[PDB]
Design a protein around this nucleic acid. Sequence first.
DNA 1: GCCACCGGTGGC
DNA 2: GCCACCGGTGGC
Length: 68
Amino acid sequence: KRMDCPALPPGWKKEEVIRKSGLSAGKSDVYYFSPSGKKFRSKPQLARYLGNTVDLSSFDFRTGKMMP
DNA sequence: GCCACCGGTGGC
DNA sequence: GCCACCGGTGGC
Ligand SMILES: [Ca+2]
């Protein structure tokens, strides 16, 4: 389920998806959804989309929390 | 053509 | 040996 992510700017949501088949079955992937609905799979991709005005240095992609 | 899904690996 | 990061792609 897509859950609100207050660590991000307004509108952002986070989803954890459990892999269903293959040797990695049971592994989790984390996705973030922009307010406009675009999907992001890594902190570099996320940071490039948001740009310099948003400080993600303390941002922990896997947990979705600021981890300082 | 798109994209959800799993596999591969460079850097640590 | 692990995993952040992203490539390949089958099913639509
Ligand atoms: Ca916020």
